Automatic annotation (TrEMBL), chains A, C:
<comment type="subunit">
    <text>Homohexamer; forms a hexameric ring structure with 6-fold symmetry characteristic of AAA+ ATPases. Interacts (via N-terminus) with host RTN3 (via reticulon domain); this interaction is important for viral replication. Interacts with capsid protein VP3; this interaction may be important for virion morphogenesis.</text>
</comment>
<protein>
    <recommendedName>
        <fullName>Genome polyprotein</fullName>
    </recommendedName>
</protein>
<comment type="subunit">
    <text>Interacts with protein 3CD.</text>
</comment>
<comment type="similarity">
    <text>Belongs to the picornaviruses polyprotein family.</text>
</comment>
<comment type="function">
    <text>Capsid protein VP3: Forms an icosahedral capsid of pseudo T=3 symmetry with capsid proteins VP2 and VP3. The capsid is 300 Angstroms in diameter, composed of 60 copies of each capsid protein and enclosing the viral positive strand RNA genome.</text>
</comment>
<comment type="function">
    <text>Protein 3A: Localizes the viral replication complex to the surface of membranous vesicles. It inhibits host cell endoplasmic reticulum-to-Golgi apparatus transport and causes the disassembly of the Golgi complex, possibly through GBF1 interaction. This would result in depletion of MHC, trail receptors and IFN receptors at the host cell surface.</text>
</comment>
Automatic annotation (TrEMBL), chain B:
<feature type="domain" description="GOLD">
    <location>
        <begin position="19"/>
        <end position="125"/>
    </location>
</feature>
<protein>
    <submittedName>
        <fullName>Peripherial benzodiazepine receptor associated protein</fullName>
    </submittedName>
</protein>
């Protein structure tokens, strides 16, 4: 399991949709569902 | 007082692949009305370490910033709200948890009188 | 600085011409020069 | 006990066309294997490196590929059994841990081909 800032440095150069899947599979990153978040609208 | 780490930010060329990926899976897509502001509250995961974000729009730019809310409540500025061209490219970034709290991702259409904005976004956390 | 097998696992899934460059930059991989290579031909 | 050689890793990637045009910018990196020939490329273990990484592709046809290790009459250990690879379709790649100090033999085997020569694009790196 690599370090969080190492993930970032990797993506900055090579970020693509395939990498995101790989990082997700290895469990390096964890997708947050919308159900775990809230929205706020204002004017 | 805590030393807040500087945020990292970058872009990637594939907007179309990205958006079409956002459509099929979560169908999470925001419509930011004329002169509106949409704030996405993202509470820090207890097992969490870092926050990672991605956002894009269809036909137009939109203001984007990141604020952190501690847990009347204290607020810290991570990414100053500014207009990015995310209709051309996918805009992404990352930041380290200063502590337990709630991230505020702001999509700011305030300047736009006549134009609503479609927003495709995604967020991850690490350990 | 990732382990050699970790480099390999990364590649197997996402290997591309862009990743090679990135891994070349970080110094994770070093291209062997023509000096170290010899050609042998046999029928 | 005797040295236990680590198993090799192998994989493929879909972009063949992009890989060649990268190599074509270097002449010495392109080899022409003749009819019923076996062209062996010797790659000595770097003192600093712990590992060897290889990549190869062919133009219109399959070619035999295997990897042997020559210690430093000399001993020869078989890493990758020589077999015909579809690398005309895809870029074939792999990695292996140094069993010790010595010389890697990357063999491109055209022996079975009577009438057809093979063009070979290859590249090699190493890791610490």
């Amino acid at each position: 399991i690599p370090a969080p800032p190492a993930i970032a440095d990797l993506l900055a150069s090579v970020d693509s949709e395939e990498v995101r899947e790989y990082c997700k599979k290895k469990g390096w990153i964890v997708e947050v569902p919308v159900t775990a978040t809230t929205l706020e609208r204002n004017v | 007082l805590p030393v807040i780490a500087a945020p990292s930010m970058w872009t990637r060329p594939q907007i179309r692949d990205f958006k079409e990926k956002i459509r099929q899976d979560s169908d999470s897509v925001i419509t930011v009305g004329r002169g509106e502001v949409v704030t996405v509250r993202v509470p820090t995961h207890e097992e969490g370490s870092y926050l990672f974000w991605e956002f894009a729009t269809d036909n137009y730019d939109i203001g984007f910033g990141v604020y952190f809310e501690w847990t009347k409540p204290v607020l810290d500025e991570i990414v100053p709200v500014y207009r990015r061209d995310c209709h051309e490219e996918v805009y992404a970034g990352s930041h380290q948890y200063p502590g337990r709290g709630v991230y505020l991702l702001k999509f700011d259409n305030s300047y736009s009188l006549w134009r609503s904005k479609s927003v495709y976004y995604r967020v991850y956390y690490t350990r």
